[PDB]
Amino acid sequence: KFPRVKNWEVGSITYDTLSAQAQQDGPCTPRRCLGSLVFPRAPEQLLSQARDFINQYYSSIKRSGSQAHEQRLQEVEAEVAATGTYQLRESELVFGAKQAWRNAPRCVGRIQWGKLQVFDARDCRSAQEMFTYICNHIKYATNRGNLRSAITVFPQRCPGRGDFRIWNSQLVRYAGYRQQDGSVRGDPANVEITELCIQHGWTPGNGRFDVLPLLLQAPDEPPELFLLPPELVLEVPLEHPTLEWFAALGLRWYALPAVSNMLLEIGGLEFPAAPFSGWYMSTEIGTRNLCDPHRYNILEDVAVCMDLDTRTTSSLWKDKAAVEINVAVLHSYQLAKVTIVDHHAATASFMKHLENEQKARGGCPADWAWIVPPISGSLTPVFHQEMVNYFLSPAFRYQPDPW
């Protein structure tokens, strides 16, 4: 019942004892494995998760079964008996946010999990204070290009009340507009959110990197359109160290990866608005965002500019073009002094995280398909590491869009 986990580059074996704690079920069954799928599908309820989280917390601080332990238990009981929900102590909030990141199986950057700035926004009312909470977050996390991990936790879900929601999937998004020639100008990923902005007031630009407004939702109100100050949104124009024409392509990306549409769950509590940010790995921008066929899809453009032989796959023009786009990314972020990490350094750090986590708690939930980079997969050590994927709590989950 303890999975044997091998690394094939080295031969080392470990055993994942932690997978036995898997609180929730994943998509897989003995009959078929669905690990590749992106989205893979009363008061007595809330108590058992909430109780289980508090032991987690007090065990984490080497003070379990203690007087302070037993007092928080009867606190949350009576809180839930008197309100139907309960409130986290701020330190429990900090712990639960770090753990939820630590528990994310698809995040290659969890070497950084113990270093996360948590901003408590649980006292937030209305969308304007949302916007102010978000702008501080952005300015702290951006830090003039010396990026720092942060999360801002808005009021938890509670009965009878609506919900705090950020309609945008990220804090910084480029618009995608449809033409009558059928294509998209800008980021195809953001077509739907883009028209929602136009339909909620926004007047549309017409560039390929038009930063979107924020559609912020306070409980039981329609979302409100907010514009981010350009001086707030740090961007990196892309150039290549030796291909002088690359700059002319006009490519650019933003500094801050800030995911704003996932639900944060701690101890049976649910925070549908808790945006979190780190820094980018280069492949996210220069491979997926720019070269996915359903994203900016620039790979052929670049290949033409390199005078590559695009009429035969076996010249590997796609591979050569992709490598240079990633080199462009890394060189550009370093030139602008914006924190970036290349896929080799990142995956070597994740391996260190695996080792640390094997000692800390007997394993690490890891989703091989998302951990292995989208270029040079087998050139990184995570390709040769067997992984075990399971769901622990506290956690980040996807959720339905608000509309």
- The answer to the question of whether 124 is labelled as a binding residue is no
Report the DSSP pairing between strands 280-281 and 340-341.
parallel
Task: State the Cα–Cα distance between residues 138 and 126, nearest whole angstrom.
Answer: 19
How far apart are CB 231 and a copy of itself at their closest, in Å? 28
Interface residues with Gd ion (CB under 5 A)? 242
Active site residue 397: no
Q: Which two tokens stand for residue 180?
A: 């009558």
85 or 260: CB nearest ligand HEM: 260
In the sheet that holds 150-153, the strands lie side by side as 117-120, 150-153, 276-277, 258-259
And the tokens for 54? Answer: 């508090």
**Residue 79 makes contact with ligand H4B by CB under 6 A:** no
Does residue 174 have a known ligand-binding role? Answer: no
Cα–chain center distance at 143: 19
Kind and range of the H or E run holding 95: helix 90-103
26 binds ligand A1CN4 (CB under 6 A): no
User: In whole angstroms, what is the distance from residue 123 CA to residue 111 CA?
Assistant: 31
Instruction: Rule CB under 6 A: say whether 370 interacts with ligand HEM.
Output: yes
Strands 150-153 and 117-120: parallel
Closest CB to ligand HEM among residues 101, 174: 101
Count of Cβ atoms closer than 10 Å to residue 146 Cβ: 10
Q: How far apart are CA 165 and CA 260, in angstroms?
A: 9
Smallest distance, a copy of itself to C-beta of residue 185, A: 18
Is 253 a residue that touches ligand A1CN4 (CB under 6 A)?
no
Binding site for a copy of itself (CB under 8 A): 3-6, 8-11, 16, 19-20, 22, 25-38, 282, 287-288, 291-294, 299, 313-316, 318-320, 322-323, 326-327, 330, 334, 342, 344-345, 348, 368-369, 372-379, 381, 383-384, 386-390
* Structure tokens, 370: 């998302």
Binding segment (CB under 6 A) for ligand H4B, from list 117-125, 205-213, 352-360, 379-387: 379-387
Scan residues 175-204 and list those touching Ca ion (CB under 5 A): 180
User: Contact with ligand HEM (CB under 6 A): which of 134, 151, 285, 375?
Assistant: 151
Q: Considering the candidates 197, 279, 317, 364, report the single residue annotated as catalytic.
A: 279
The region of 23-31, 182-190, 242-250, 271-279 touching ligand HEM under the rule CB under 6 A is: 271-279
CB atoms near residue 237 (< 10 Å): 13
Please report whether residue 38 would count as binding ligand H4B according to CB under 6 A. yes
Catalytic-labelled residue, pool 101, 107, 291, 364? 107
Q: Which long-range contacts (CB under 8 A, 24 or more apart) does 72-77 make?
A: 76/47, 76/50, 76/51, 77/47
Query: With respect to ligand HEM, which residue has the nearer C-beta, 72 or 331?
Result: 331
Pick from 170, 181, 206, 153: nearest CA to 285 = 170
Q: Would you state the structure tokens that stand for residue 80, as one six-digit string?
A: 């839930």
Q: Would you state the structure tokens that stand for residue 264, as one six-digit string?
A: 């944060």
Contact between 28 and Zn ion (CB under 5 A)?
yes
33, 248, 316, 345: residue in contact with Zn ion (rule CB under 5 A): 33
Q: Is 90 a catalytic residue?
A: no
Is 107 labeled as catalytic in the residue annotation? Answer: yes
Q: Is 110 annotated in the active site?
A: yes
Question: How far apart (Å, rounded) are the C-alpha atoms in residues 264 and 257?
Answer: 17
Which C-beta is closer to Zn ion: that of 20 or that of 33? Answer: 33
Does 158 appear as a known binding residue?
Answer: no
Query: Which one is catalytic: 284, 317, 324, 364?
Result: 284
| Cβ-based neighbour number of residue 194 at 10 Å | 26
Q: What type of residue sits at position 75?
A: E
Which candidate, 373, 139, 111, 112, places its Cα nearest to that of 256? 139
* Among the residue ranges 86-94, 107-115, 194-202, 357-365, the one whose residues contact ligand HEM (CB under 6 A): 107-115
SS3 262: coil
Which of Cl ion, Zn ion, ligand A1CN4, none does 28 bind, CB closer than 5 to 8 A by kind?
Answer: Zn ion
Provide the annotated active-site residues.
107, 110, 279, 284
Q: Name the site residues for ligand HEM (rule: CB under 6 A).
A: 101, 104, 106-109, 112, 116, 149, 151, 276, 278-279, 281, 284, 341, 346, 370, 396
